[PDB]
Point group: C3
Chain length 542, copies 3
């Protein structure tokens, strides 16, 4: 061993075993919490909370956390909050000064920036207590107990802590939070008295931040990135963000538009949010009408329903599709029935039929004489996240030549209103990639084009995220310590804008998901200079 030590044993070297331990600026942090001023004026009387931060001792601040006291939900229907309820109820956030807006973000973009922060996401409300679809039995029954959720309003001032902090520069800072209508953050059946709930519900907010009391602060200018959103017209595959002079990134995604529907869906998995969870919740809801053990032909189904007695061999053939169903402990007086067309969709009477019953291979279970119901054991099916994301209105579409919804009255009563504001793609999990081509143009010249989502793969790799978006990043320079790298305009050559064009993929004219309306969302991060001369001021880089 000693011979290797002697093999170890003159150049100028950097000390990697000691540090010169520099003394920082003298400061003292403090967690400050303020109650706001609530306003409900004009646009559908929307809720706006205003917080004024004016202190001679608060020199700088960062890490904004908005808390919300959710009330006790009493009643008789089925009710649950959407996952991350705290983020979903934020429509817009705006930080301002005497000189105007310093930074502002749309609710969905704040969520998108925090999507990879599991801690922040939990805090906003991701619990079985909140997200499970609870049931009221009596008019005085408690559906949900009161709860407090915490929303981390991630800002550019948190990146490098004290270094990136917002300096107040002897000015009043006003944080303004615009809320989404409570209908958005709630999942309910028709049975629930939403009318009374909507009237009585009030957002109860409190803004908290980390304040810094700094002795002899030496302020210098900085740069900030402001996200700017462009939502295209319904089913328009283009968006243009004008006046692009110094952008650090460009993000592209799609959103479904459910305005052509009642926002009612057959099932929701609640707290369990995996792709398998959405599917299982759906299959579970259909099974009660799909396999019926009755004496004799089942009653209470539309005349359009084709309920067939299962043969001795257990195989029911629905055209090309074969469904094997074998139920144990069936009474001698009863028979096993299969609903041959629970949900079906067709463009013409001679067209291809999209039938949900055809999506089942094998159904096995045991009948309970005690509870007079079937307890399914093993199911073989080809159901997917797209089926679970079909608004019930699209099965009943004018475009559908058949009845479409052949379920029982009971099943239809259990349908849920889902108005989740932050849905992407055409499914609840944004699994299906509906973009075949992406084309970005700086002016009239093609800046980037792709077929596969390589820009999404890079976005996920570079940010270590499981939920990325097709993103072009122009800045690979360290934040705060350097002026960000940007795509830079040439007004003379008319390179004032970024135009995005997509080429969507298609399904059969016979799949209800074909009729889901899409909107293209383009997000641009513009570079701004922060000056602290006469209070806090921001200037667009040009």
């Amino acid at each position: 061993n000693n011979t290797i030590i002697n093999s170890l044993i003159s150049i100028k070297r950097s000390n990697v075993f000691a540090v010169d331990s520099q003394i920082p600026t003298l400061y003292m942090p403090q967690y400050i919490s303020l109650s706001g001023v609530m306003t409900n004026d004009g646009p559908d009387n929307q809720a706006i909370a205003s917080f004024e931060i004016r202190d001679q001792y608060i020199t700088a601040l960062n890490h904004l956390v908005l808390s919300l006291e959710l009330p006790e939900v009493k009643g008789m229907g089925r009710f649950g909050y959407v996952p991350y309820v705290g983020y979903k109820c934020i429509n817009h956030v705006s930080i301002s000064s005497c000189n105007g807006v310093i930074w502002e973000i749309e609710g969905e973009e704040l969520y998108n920036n925090c999507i990879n922060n599991t801690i922040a996401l939990k805090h906003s409300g991701y619990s079985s207590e909140l997200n499970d679809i609870s049931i009221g039995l009596t008019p005085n029954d408690t559906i949900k107990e009161p709860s407090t959720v915490y929303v981390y309003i991630k800002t550019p001032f948190d990146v490098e802590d004290t270094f990136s902090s917002l300096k107040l520069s002897d000015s009043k800072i006003t944080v303004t939070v615009t809320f989404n209508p409570v209908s958005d953050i709630v999942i309910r059946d028709s049975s629930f008295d939403f009318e009374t709930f909507n009237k009585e519900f009030v957002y109860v907010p409190e803004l908290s931040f980390i304040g810094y009391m700094v002795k002899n602060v030496q302020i210098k200018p900085s740069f900030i990135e402001k996200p700017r959103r462009v939502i295209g017209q319904i089913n328009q595959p283009t968006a243009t963000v004008t006046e692009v002079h110094a952008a650090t990134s460009l993000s592209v995604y799609t959103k479904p538009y459910y305005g052509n529907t009642d926002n009612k869906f057959i099932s929701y998995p609640g707290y369990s949010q995996d792709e398998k969870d959405y599917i299982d919740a759906y299959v579970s809801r259909l099974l009660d009408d799909l396999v019926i053990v009755s004496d004799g032909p089942p009653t209470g189904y539309p005349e359009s329903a084709e309920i067939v007695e299962v043969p001795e061999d257990g195989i029911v053939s629905i055209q090309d599709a074969d469904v094997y169903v074998k139920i144990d402990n069936v009474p001698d007086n009863m028979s096993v029935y299969l609903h041959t067309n629970l949900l079906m969709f067709g463009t013409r009477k001679n067209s291809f039929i999209y039938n949900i019953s055809k999506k089942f291979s094998a159904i096995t279970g045991t009948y309970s004489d005690a509870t007079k119901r079937t307890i399914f054991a093993h199911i073989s099916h080809s159901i997917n996240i797209i089926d679970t994301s079909i608004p019930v209105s699209l099965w009943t579409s004018q475009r559908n030549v058949y009845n479409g919804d052949n379920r029982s009255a009971e099943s239809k009563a259990k349908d849920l209103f889902i108005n989740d504001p932050f849905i992407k793609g055409i499914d609840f999990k944004n699994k299906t990639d509906i973009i075949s081509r992406l084309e970005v143009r700086f002016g009239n010249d093609v800046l980037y084009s792709e077929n596969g989502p390589i820009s999404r793969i890079y976005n996920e790799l570079l940010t270590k995220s499981n939920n990325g978006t097709r993103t072009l990043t122009f800045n690979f320079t360290p934040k705060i310590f350097f002026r960000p790298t940007t795509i830079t305009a040439n007004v003379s050559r008319g390179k004032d804008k970024l135009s995005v064009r997509v080429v969507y993929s298609t399904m059969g004219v016979n799949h209800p998901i074909y009729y889901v309306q899409k909107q293209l969302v383009v997000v641009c991060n513009d570079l701004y200079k922060v000056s602290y001369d006469q209070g806090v001021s921001i200037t667009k880089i040009m």
Copy 2:
């Protein structure tokens, strides 16, 4: 595309594409492992392992890892290790030189610092193999096979690798590990011969660390943070840490005190540690006594037990509560019975009753003729984490007007001794927040006060942790490269101390968990200067 590359094309610029690649200090790392010296003197003859580090070539060190050789557990009872068994058996760790203690930590605080390190936590012993509750059948049977567990003793010397490393100078460094009783790290039934196990069990430790052999080390002074904790009096909502002169943080949490009990609990979920897992383990244990299938009235239950035959409609009414129990394949000669008061608690006769049977709404299952038992299918219940965290001693408490434990002898035999040293709150998962208010005072002046756990929300956000504590951090300055920012005393004004006052929520005099004793835990991180002049020396900042 070329017009955009021409749109890209004199200011002083920082090179972001090249680096000057500076030569570091000449060193050679080495993984060194040492066997210690075991001592069992004085306080209940507690186990203390001592490791002496001194090598003409070891210049500096970091990343301490304690290996523990767990023996083969042979015998007849039910036995399991606590999750993260390696951390749980550490009572205290102390690094010291000829000049005295350099750094020391209480076992629970070392665990708290490593709670967000999933890798370190797995290494300490978190598996099906160690943490499941295993069963012995013969006196020579193997309950547990031998295993090695690795405990990462996180120190302030690992933060910035070689830069933050502990320099040994020429002094002898002594690492001293104080071990908790084996009783603490084991979960067992009464059937297990713990008496023989306790006598025969010996901690078998080995300390490993990364040692650096540095040629011509140039040592400079440093700063280190030392955690200091104060445990309040049983049930007292106050604690004070005296002599606070330069603290970087203050943390507040509570701990249950189970000294007033036998430390016996009805159930443990083993390796599965989710809130649902604790609850499911509990429900599973109760169900065997809760719904009985017998010919006729069930036998072998206390006279105080009220077992009722389930009516034809399947609904059994226990006062206000309605329990629906429908079991399939019941023999013709037998009936279904419900235990109306399995577990009961009352402080007064003909007054409020905490009844565990009332916590069930629906119970379905099928009777097995082959194994003469019920295989429960679906259970609707309101059992919580608190219920699963009630010691069984409290159900039998002298406060209790009722017998309380109306379970079978068989059920009671399956109860488990749990002595896990690192339990927080009043439940096994520290879910229930028992602090309504927190008030911190620097001297006589209020430094901070809160109602909601905002300080915990910030602690979780700032440290990216799922298991935070109400913490006030005063240092937001980068570690190692800067002198930490601290709350600084003014002895003249009497600002020598930090006094914590909480306000506890209450469960109610008729809830068995009301009788769980609490302890306030206040943790203060004091700033210290490290000098390497005459061996390693530390000096408290004042």
Copy 3:
């Protein structure tokens, strides 16, 4: 509160609230994707894709991503891709210039470097769509739909983004990807027409990278680490990497060699890759032959099979082992049977026996008259990851004194060919540590020796990984900004090499897994200097 802000209120201090915001090098990033040139000119017509990056505008590059287009798999057998299919089909990657190879890696080492990057791993092909063992029913049936996977080729140029980027000193850079045969990345039964699949399968690659267009680049030299591996002779417990002059790390692991077998295994868990998942998949496959309900003695099993009728008390004794099997709803004309020796191994008659039936304690379930099969409720067993990792060839081994595979013809038909190239250890999860002692020698001198895998514990702790390897790291100096610390050679003493010796564990008294052939793997990271005098050049540090 104000008295504490006055308690806050001259030394030179570092500004922690402002930054001088330095302007970076003027650049513009771009995501570039190129189609390659496919070659199959030996050794065994192995597929080699070549990508040439020659651009007057591309100054530097990093973040290489290989996309592969997987075709539609049509046919009749059972087929599934291996988890992380994208990484598994890479045999070798080589980046080179006019001056030769700059950096190259063996496919397994690229995977090992990316094993802790969950995002990259998902992208390469980890999904129920890709990894589930799918079934074809007709010769025209679609087993797998077409899919695209993305393989992140992690290089030393991504570490510090633009700073660590590969500069192209106006030279053509050629990326060369060598592909493993498609057999390696596929899991199939005998029924599948692999012959036609292998003929028709073609790798369809596309290389993507982040190019940087830099104005007035100021290039400086750098250092790079190149992984180099040596695979020992079959069952030889030693390996030696020659010409070691400046290594930053040394890694040691073993690989099973399944060449002495048909690469057929009884079960695979598909997408579900937990240790429990592998075990459950295995137990599920054995159960159909383990507990038989027939009239009367079961038929279609080898004469060597010992199938016993389960007694009234339900307990069947297989020597020391007791198996309790209780099946419900068994017809009056039928009996319950237990296969006493489903799989048995021995190298000597009337000596030790490894019997898989003996690894079961209890088996319960209910017979379905409807599907004429047993639905197993609860199983008590002692089956582990090793048992699921034993090739069927070892049961049929010449050394085996018994028949070995006493399963039904049906069971044997469901066996799967697994040729996963990146298997470590002797089990599918590399859980079992088969090294009792490790000894590393730099020349003739012992550099390091250990018994337990402390080097693996440190590797996992230091890199924050769940799947580490026994690794000695010599560099603890920050990458890019410093010349890496290395173990240095002394050619005179013959310290030119690193010689590793291992003592494999006996793996138990009579385990078939002891006859799985092992290959000791040693990986060395050699330090290379990157120079740009004329084009891009590398030089091995000596």
